[PDB]
Amino acid sequence: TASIAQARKLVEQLKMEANIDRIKVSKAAADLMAYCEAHAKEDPLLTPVPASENPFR
Amino acid sequence: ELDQLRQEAEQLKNQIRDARKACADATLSQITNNIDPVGRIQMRTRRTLRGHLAKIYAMHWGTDSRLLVSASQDGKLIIWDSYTTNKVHAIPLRSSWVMTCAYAPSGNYVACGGLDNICSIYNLKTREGNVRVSRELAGHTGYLSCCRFLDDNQIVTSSGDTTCALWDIETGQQTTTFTGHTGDVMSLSLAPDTRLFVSGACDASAKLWDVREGMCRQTFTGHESDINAICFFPNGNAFATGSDDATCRLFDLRADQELMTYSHDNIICGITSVSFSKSGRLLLAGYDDFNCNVWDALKADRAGVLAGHDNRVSCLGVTDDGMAVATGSWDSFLKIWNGSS
Amino acid sequence: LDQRLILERLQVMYTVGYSLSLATLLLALLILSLFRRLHCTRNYIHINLFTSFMLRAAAILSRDRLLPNQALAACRTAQIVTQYCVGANYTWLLVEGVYLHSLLVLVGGSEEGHFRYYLLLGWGAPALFVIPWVIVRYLYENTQCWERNEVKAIWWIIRTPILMTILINFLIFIRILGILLSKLRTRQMRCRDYRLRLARSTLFLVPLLGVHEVVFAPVTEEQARGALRFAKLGFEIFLSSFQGFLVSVLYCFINKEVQSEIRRGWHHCRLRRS
Amino acid sequence: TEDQRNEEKAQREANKKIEKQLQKDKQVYRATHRLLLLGAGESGKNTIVKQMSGIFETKFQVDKVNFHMFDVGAQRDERRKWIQCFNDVTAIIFVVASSQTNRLQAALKLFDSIWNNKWLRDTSVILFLNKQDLLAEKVLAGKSKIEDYFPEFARYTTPEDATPEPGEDPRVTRAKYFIRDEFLRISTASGDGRHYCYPHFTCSVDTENIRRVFNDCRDIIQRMHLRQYELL
Amino acid sequence: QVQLQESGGGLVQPGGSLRLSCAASGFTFSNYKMNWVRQAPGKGLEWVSDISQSGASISYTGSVKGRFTISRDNAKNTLYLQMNSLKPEDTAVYYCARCPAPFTRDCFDVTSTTYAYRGQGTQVTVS
């Protein structure tokens, strides 16, 4: 039937999901904040750009 | 016999949850509590496009961050020059019920689609310059909800039925099919490395796919209602999901679990559009309560409100260089917003 | 002396009535002009009607303050402008009624290009009907400034277009109220909506009573005898003033979307400030 | 350089041409009336479309008025997402088979859900209670879906509003008016919105649906225009 | 993640009394309108009852009203359906469903073939 087929596909997907290796959330947060601070200068949204070279003035 | 399969599946989900809990050694808020707040973000409108005469669903910025396409329910696809407000092109669509549109990275093609289950690709550069249907892609069962140009010859789309498809524009048939979702797929986003993409469906879950071999790599089930918008972080190792929970959430592929929640008591309406800034520190979310909010991604604190739309904000976009933020809404107006020093 | 003091109070009340008529009309024009979004045919017609009332009130005030050669020429110009603008006000009310009737009755098309024609009727008919009166008054019975009480022919030739236009407006509004009553009875609302018919009829039809206001304009002599005399004169000056005040308030302030939009703008300004 | 002026004036020319084309299209767009023909599964939608690929569009002109009708053919049963696209249509023609499982209950739930939609609270609904002749036969034979499913039909009486139908069995009229009363009670519940319901016992293939839809759209447009002028 | 799990049911004689208990552990229970739907062995899905967020608004599909009672408990984040005097036509599978949008008087796709926010099955039989 279709029920057994969808069940076996689902269990295969979950067992393929469970074999991956995770990374500590603290390290992920550190990497994310490092990326945020590294490109902080090159963001006109966070730091408004002077109107002399703002094309939308 | 089936009960054994259900027991095995629930055991696998329990062990995955246990692994995720063991992986959680800290919290994003706890580590970022010692970071200077972004502060109030006073963004004001600079340009207003008043060409459309019907509610607008989709828009996409160009690679040069100057030309932008917009899709409106009167069967209209307008390409504007944002700098001078002029209308570069106006394309009449065969099907008036458009729900998505994409602008090719090379700028030579424009994607469109909707309730007709057909993805129309328009060639902007011809021998005379007249726009015409370059190719129609058919094969999807449900309504075409989103489409993004993977390349000048490859396009990935998501349909109303639980199916995404990576096509070959040269030949016009699905090269790869991604299935496994439970509800309608509402949004799509392409990673900067072009290798992966996330899809958010109406089953309160988001799935990560790779276009090369074509099966789901990770599934995140942090939400509890329909997901309407998704977008990768500029780093490419994280993304954000907006749902009908009046809540935006941040996921990491490596962490494979929640990082930060963007809920507020005063917010009751769902989120229709989510996008990041160039640095990723600011998360701009369009809401159904006529407004738009700016969230400090590392602090989950509101930094500003993009009020000024007479209807719900349906589409939101940020330029590649991050010079301005476009917001479209159902009042048939696009507003471009920028900050002032 | 009681008659003299009540007449003085009457005159100052009349002047202050036109004063707040100017104030409300300016406020309405400013509200409906600088929003860039309330730009439709109906709002354009409202703007035209409001500016026609502006010209009427300004001309009337100037003529009143100018009444005792440069002075004679100024008085004649003020009188001509007054006649032209009082014609323009009624023809613009008729234009707005015609626009509403066509927008509510005509099936299909919904052509918005007729506005130019409305504009042609907005300030084209009054000139065409006042020019023969001007040339007749210049050629015959050339009174010093405005005293028109000796020749009835000029009175008929200047009042017939006004009466015809306002009768057409009255018939059109009767048809509109009939349609509205049919809709209300079809929905079968409550008694509050039953009296809402009269509530929306009287307020929109007292500008039509502006004609009974203008038939006997304030031309009163040094004294008059009779309670009903000054009673009806005070009633008239009333409609005169409000011929500005209530039309200005009802056609724009209670539109039911403008105050919502101004509240939205107030909230946006508060958010921007803090 | 003179180039910048050259492309600037070319952009101005293109923009003015596109603006003219957009105004010309705006006239036609405001001329036409858009309708969404939903339905309660099998209710006669196909027969009605025949009488009068994702989505099917039908263009028909009556009294020099153009109507586009949109029917969602190849779509999934989950309507909670793509139904928001039809908030600004003139009307939603909802066809209900008044005659397997309880189809009437599902139709009532669908109508209640559409009525209570936050985006569809300004969109009018035209009810087509089709299969009136089939319902007549059911009642006459004894087949009931009005009392069997709804035990309140015993404590129900024919309303004294009207009975435009000609000579017919009182039971059939009572049944059809009971169904109409259920739909009207669902529609007129406490709430807010600028929408209205137009019940119709059509069961008609003689182009009467054209007149009914045209009259309902005329009424909707007139009511909207009067509400703009706050006359009601 | 919603994890709507219900229990109860079994084989009973006609005229019996059953109490189905449904539990949700993936969202805020009090923010959503809850309902029960029924799927017959040979028929399709059919909505049978519904209760609002607070319990003030309760409605039934008919032919079960008075016979069926629905009641939610927000403190335990659970819900109960008490059915009395079973007829030999209620033998079917009962699903405890939560329709998607919170704080909304509307919800569209409870009785769909492939609904995502619907719980597992629970067979109840009468003979």
Residue numbers in the entry:
A (entry chain G): 6 to 62
B (entry chain B): 3 to 343
C (entry chain R): 128 to 195, 210 to 415
D (entry chain A): 9 to 60, 205 to 251, 262 to 394
E (entry chain N): 1 to 127
Lines from the paper:
Class B1 G protein-coupled receptors (GPCRs) are important regulators of many physiological functions such as glucose homeostasis, which is mainly mediated by three peptide hormones, i.e., glucagon-like peptide-1 (GLP-1), glucagon (GCG), and glucose-dependent insulinotropic polypeptide (GIP). GLP-1R, glucagon receptor (GCGR) and glucose-dependent insulinotropic polypeptide receptor (GIPR) are validated therapeutic targets for type 2 diabetes and obesity. Here, we report cryo-electron microscopy structures of the human GLP-1 receptor (GLP-1R), GCG receptor (GCGR), and GIP receptor (GIPR) in complex with Gs proteins without the presence of cognate ligands. These ligand-free complexes share a similar intracellular architecture to those bound by endogenous peptides, in which, the Gs protein alone directly opens the intracellular binding cavity and rewires the extracellular orthosteric pocket to stabilize the receptor in a state unseen before.
The ligand-free GIPR displays the most profound structural feature of TM packing, in which the extracellular portion of TM6 and ECL3 fold inward to occupy the TMD pocket. Consequently, the kink in TM6 adopts a unique angle (148° measured at the Cα of D3346.33b–P3486.47b–V3606.59b) different from those of GIP-bound GIPR (113°) and peptide-free GLP-1R and GCGR. Instead of ECL2, TM6–ECL3 of ligand-free GIPR folds toward the TMD core and occupies the orthosteric pocket. W287ECL2 orientates its side chain from the TM3–TM4 crevice in the GIP–GIPR–Gs structure to occupy the orthosteric site in the ligand-free structure, reflecting the engagement of GIPR ECL2 in the closure of TMD ligand-binding pocket. Notably, in the ligand-free GIPR, the TM6–ECL3 juncture is sandwiched by the TM5–ECL2 juncture and the extracellular portion of TM7, weaving an intensive interaction network by a hydrogen bond between Q2203.33b and R1902.67b, and several hydrophobic contacts (R3005.40b–V3556.54b/V3566.55b, W2744.60b–Q2243.37b, and W287ECL2–L1942.71b/V3606.59b). The ligand-free GLP-1R and GCGR deform the PxxG motif in a manner similar to the agonist-bound structures, while the ligand-free GIPR prefers a moderately kinked TM6 that is significantly different from the fully active structures.
